[PDB]
Nucleic acid binder design. Structure first.
Ligand SMILES: [Mg+2]
Lengths: 59, 113, 211, 158, 183
RNA sequence: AAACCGGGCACUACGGUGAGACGUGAAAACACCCGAUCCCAUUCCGACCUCGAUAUGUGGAAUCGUCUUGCGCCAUAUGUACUGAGAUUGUUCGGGAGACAUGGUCCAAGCCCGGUGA
């Protein structure tokens, strides 16, 4: 790595969905390091079929 | 591309028969002075030698190569070779261990041709 | 003639947490980060004020991490998949193995004598099935045995027939509790505790289990 | 010390020895480099395109003759980048493609939308098509690469 | 649209200064010759502007107080991986740097050699185990395993999982995904 | 001490340069496996090179061997083309390819340092 050429780095903390802590490096864009929690934001989308749409009405 | 075979430097006016060749491994350092007409080893100094591999701790680094260069320069000056001509291989530049050996020989007092 | 080979299973729980690093390694990593910070571009405070303008107070919830030392560790509670987090745990049962030195129970791994299966693989999943009931939270690795032990008669014991024992490897996927049957007793022990329980096979299991 | 390479050395190497036929312990595939290259139609001029590459990579890119931009990541920087992308991978179902010895991933703006550290300063990454991320492995077989990626992609959901 | 003041900020970020300006000795002599002639480059002007308002310490660099790995209150001592007595003390200098690098190289080399030797013994023993089998039982066990790894096996990290966390997150996710969203 | 083995220089296309299969790391040697703090490397990156580290792991990449072989290279035909001198309007005397065909990939071998032998 050359000198005077790359951005500065910073340490931030990750918390997994089970509460596990993990330390990583990241390009310094904040004053102090933070802790980011991960959720279950999977956001899976489903669409109903035509026979399902028919049965939702005419039964 | 196909790399062509290396030739020794061209004869111009005078012979200059003593050629200094260096070699470095993972464990030791070696330096040789070759007499070109007879294809023999006029002089040698290496950290693999029986009288040298126990008198120094580290046998592989820049300090070891500098000590080997100093020993080789004093051996050449007592075997009466006042000047040597340096040969550099395919990947050697004037840097690090090569630089240490050359500067140690020059400070020992051998002229460089 | 030479037959009645047995398939045993090595049931493991992997490490939950990372072991303690070497202090020299930790010191060098910290020093390397702090030294390399000197020669790198420092972003302006107007650029960091984009995130400083996004400074706010929510319903504050403070995060407290779980301790690496567990109540099972400090109470020496065996039969638990919550103790010895930074090491590996291995399943040992208590009962009668195929060896018939005596009637008395002795610690051993789950196993089965091979009769008609295509694979000792298929023998070993049945051998683990007969112990833990079901095979949903397990992962068997490899179609080949990780080690073998050939038992021959010696001068003190000429009665048992010659037989081989082949070890296969299986891992806990997600469960922290199991219904262990077809045995008197069970335990979750480490490599060193396994060597303490087995004085006679320590040389073999030291090479077979990687610490 | 670090979770990703520690997990590789302690869990995946033994199981990859046991699962396949190997003559030596040096024949096990590993992890070489990560190559990130921006998607084709872009501006070459705006500072957003340069900053939106410098920020998630952590190192300066190369701009060759201005028609090509590239960053290559090796070592602990590559490990930090990989453990970031594998953690943010668990919030969606991003598709990847397994080649003969490497993994291809598509770094869209919908990735940095879900990156929790890049929720702020999002106007840098807005109006950017995205990047192409390459993960080079020392794998002889596409099935070795598939096994290695299935080992590395872990979550606590399911 | 796209603010030109915002782009003027981003060019400052891309040309951001450094706490200490390192010069190759082939460039330091060019700088000294320029200073003899009386010419000041713009980067040297920015450096002297830095040094008349402070310096390396003004941008959070200290040699006596190193910045620890991790965020505030979540360092290795706070988590309990290390005690405060088994931490090696140093400063941010080159003299500590050589010694720390050499010790790190020795320790990492020995650990790597131990892991490779253990794997070699295990592989040799597996190769010996496959050859003491009957014929069809051996041809069955020469087949490579190509079943992918389970996605539900965990990965090691610095903290064991909280007991009342994962099920809570699942319950919140299913309470959100309950009912249907209006179109 | 005289043989053998490893490294460097020197000799060389029958000694070159590719491909395949089988092996080999001698208590020694070579290389890899590990790291990027100073030197150096990168118009980004320890990829290449460089600098440090390795009571013993591996010969997966290279390096050493053994055979099979493909181009080359060396040696040699038989015949023809062509050609020097000479006019029986070339009836004589000389030279002799290319492409085919046949075989080989030899023999000999110097200096220094280290190890086993001693
Ligand atoms: Mg001919």
């Amino acid at each position: 790595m050359k000198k005077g050429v790359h951005p500065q780095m910073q340490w931030i903390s990750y918390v997994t969905q089970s509460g596990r802590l993990m330390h990583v490096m990241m390009t310094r864009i904040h004053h102090v390091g933070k802790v980011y929690h991960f959720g279950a934001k999977r956001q899976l989308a489903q669409s109903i079929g035509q026979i399902a749409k028919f049965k939702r009405r005419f039964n | 591309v196909i790399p062509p075979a290396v030739r020794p430097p061209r004869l111009f006016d005078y012979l200059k028969p003593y050629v200094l060749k260096m070699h470095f491994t993972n464990k030791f350092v070696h330096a040789q002075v070759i007499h070109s007409p007879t294809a023999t080893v006029a002089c040698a100094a290496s950290s693999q030698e029986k009288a040298l591999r126990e008198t120094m701790g580290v046998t592989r680094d820049v300090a070891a190569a500098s000590k080997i260069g100093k020993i080789l320069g004093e051996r050449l000056l007592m075997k009466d070779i006042p000047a040597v001509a340096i040969h550099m291989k395919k990947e050697q530049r004037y840097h690090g261990k090569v630089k240490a050996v050359i500067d140690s020989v020059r400070e020992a007092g051998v002229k460089l041709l | 003639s030479s037959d009645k080979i047995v398939a045993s299973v090595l049931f493991e729980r992997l490490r939950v947490v990372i072991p303690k690093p070497d202090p020299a390694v930790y010191a060098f990593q910290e020093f390397k980060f702090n030294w390399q910070q000197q020669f790198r571009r420092r972003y302006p405070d107007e650029f960091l004020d984009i995130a400083k303008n996004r400074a706010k107070g929510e319903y504050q919830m403070d995060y407290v991490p779980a301790p690496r030392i567990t109540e099972a560790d400090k109470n020496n509670d065996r039969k638990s998949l919550y103790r010895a987090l930074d090491k590996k745990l291995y399943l040992l049962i208590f009962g009668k193995p195929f060896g018939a030195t005596s009637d008395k129970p002795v610690w051993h791994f789950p196993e089965k004598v091979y009769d008609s299966e295509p694979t000792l693989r298929k023998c070993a999943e049945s051998a683990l099935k007969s112990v833990v009931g079901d095979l949903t939270h397990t992962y068997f690795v490899g179609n080949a045995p990780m080690a073998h032990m050939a038992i021959q008669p010696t001068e003190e014991m000429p009665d048992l027939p010659s037989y081989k024992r082949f070890f296969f490897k299986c891992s806990v996927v997600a469960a922290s509790k199991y219904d262990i049957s077809n045995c008197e007793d069970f335990v979750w022990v480490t490599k060193d505790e396994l060597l303490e329980f087995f004085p006679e096979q320590a040389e073999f299991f030291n090479k077979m289990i990687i610490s | 010390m670090f979770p990703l390479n520690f997990h590789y050395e302690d869990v995946l190497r033994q199981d990859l020895l046991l699962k396949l036929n190997y003559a030596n312990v040096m024949e096990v595939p590993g992890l070489c480099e990560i190559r990130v290259v921006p998607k084709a139609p872009y501006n070459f001029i705006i500072k957003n395109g340069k900053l939106a590459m410098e920020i998630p990579c952590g190192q300066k890119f190369i701009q060759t003759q201005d028609l090509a931009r590239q960053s290559t990541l090796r070592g602990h920087g590559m490990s930090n980048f990989l453990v970031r992308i594998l953690t943010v991978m668990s919030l969606l179902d991003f598709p990847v493609e397994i080649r003969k010895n490497s993994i291809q991933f598509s770094m869209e703006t919908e990735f940095c939308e879900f990156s929790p550290e890049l929720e702020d300063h999002f106007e840098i990454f807005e109006h950017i098509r995205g990047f192409n991320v390459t993960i080079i492995t020392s794998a002889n077989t596409q099935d070795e690469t598939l096994l290695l990626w299935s080992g590395f992609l872990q979550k606590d959901e399911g | 649209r796209i603010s030109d003041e915002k782009q003027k900020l981003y060019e400052q970020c891309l040309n951001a200064p450094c706490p200490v300006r390192s010069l190759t000795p082939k460039e330091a002599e060019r700088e000294a010759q320029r200073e003899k002639l009386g010419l000041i480059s713009k980067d040297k002007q920015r450096d002297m502007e830095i040094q008349k308002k402070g310096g390396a310490a003004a941008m959070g660099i200290n040699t006596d107080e190193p910045m620890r790995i991790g965020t505030a209150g979540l360092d290795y001592v706070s988590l309990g991986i290390f005690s405060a007595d088994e931490l090696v003390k140093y400063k941010v200098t080159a003299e500590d740097g050589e010694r720390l690098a050499k010790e790190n190289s020795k320790v990492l080399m020995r650990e790597h050699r131990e892991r490779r030797a253990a794997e070699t013994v295990l592989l040799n023993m597996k190769k010996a185990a496959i050859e003491a089998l009957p014929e069809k039982l051996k041809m069955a066990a020469l087949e490579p395993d190509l079943t992918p790894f389970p996605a539900n096996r965990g990965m090691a990290t610095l903290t064991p999982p909280i007991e009342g966390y994962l099920e809570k997150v699942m319950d919140a996710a299913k309470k959100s995904s309950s009912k249907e969203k209006l179109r």
